[PDB]
Amino acid sequence: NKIYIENHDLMSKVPVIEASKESTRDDWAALTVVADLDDIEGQELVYYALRFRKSNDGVRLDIVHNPKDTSRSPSVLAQRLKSREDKLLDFTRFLDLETALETGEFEPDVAYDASLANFLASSNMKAGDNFVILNGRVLGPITDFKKEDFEVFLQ
């Protein structure tokens, strides 16, 4: 649990696709993708995670933006994505995601940026790293991994 418990601030601010009400408890699982969405390789991972969630409605997906470069507030992209949180399964096209990360004025959330900086240090992962956490299991860094590999780890 301890990852989930120590980080409630951050995890409360990130984009979340809730598992469906009409899925079962045996289907239910918790996927976190942590990705640098300034880079294609991070975006691509999230895209796959989205596609996976689209097919597997027992999963609760949330997405943590974890940029290597911090000159911009991490919280900007995270808010861009959080604003468009309902829309995320309507994506059909890698471009829909790019678009969603491309636009939206937001005021930096410092408390978010702090939360992130904890989460990283206490979870011994670095800024910029791409990884997934699946029901508590950290997998990464990811330096391939597509929606197959999500599927299998669910089994």
Author numbering: 673 to 815, 819 to 830
Sentences from the paper on this structure:
UGGT acts as the gatekeeper in this system because this enzyme is capable of sensing the folding states of glycoproteins as potential substrates. UGGT only transfers monoglucose residues to incompletely folded glycoproteins. UGGT is a large enzyme, comprising approximately 1500 amino acid residues, which has been putatively divided into two regions: an N-terminal folding-sensor region, which accounts for approximately 80% of the enzyme and is not homologous with any known structures, and a C-terminal catalytic domain, which accounts for the remaining 20% of the enzyme and belongs to the glycosyltransferase 8 family. On the other hand, the folding-sensor region of UGGT was found to harbour three tandem Trx-like domains: Trx1 (residues 168–379), Trx2 (residues 467–624) and Trx3 (residues 671–831).
The final model of Form 1, refined to a resolution of 3.40 Å, had an Rwork of 23.5% and Rfree of 29.2%. The crystal belonged to space group I23 with six molecules per asymmetric unit. The structures of molecules A–F were highly similar to each other with an RMSD value of 0.11–0.37 Å for superimposed Cα atoms 94–155. Molecule A in the crystal structure, which had the lowest average B value, was used for the comparative analysis and will be primarily described hereafter. As expected from the bioinformatics analysis, the crystal structure displayed a typical Trx-like fold, i.e. a five-stranded β-sheet with a β1–β3–β2–β4–β5 arrangement surrounded by six α-helices. In the crystal structure, a part of β5–α6 loop (residues 816–818) was disordered. The C-terminal α6-containing segment showed a higher crystallographic B-factor (87.7 Å2) than the average value (79.7 Å2). The α6 helix was stabilized mainly through its hydrophobic surface, containing Phe820, Phe825, Phe828 and Leu829, which made contact with the hydrophobic patch, including Leu703 (β2), Leu717, Phe724 (α2), Val804, Leu806 (β4), Leu811 (β5) and Ile814 (β5–α6 loop) (right). The Trx3 domain possesses an extensive hydrophobic patch, which is covered by the flexible C-terminal helix and can participate in interactions with hydrophobic molecules. Moreover, we provided snapshots of the 3D structure of the third Trx-like domain, in which a putative substrate-binding hydrophobic patch is intramolecularly masked or involved in an intermolecular interaction, offering a key breakthrough toward understanding of the functional mechanisms of this ER folding-sensor enzyme.
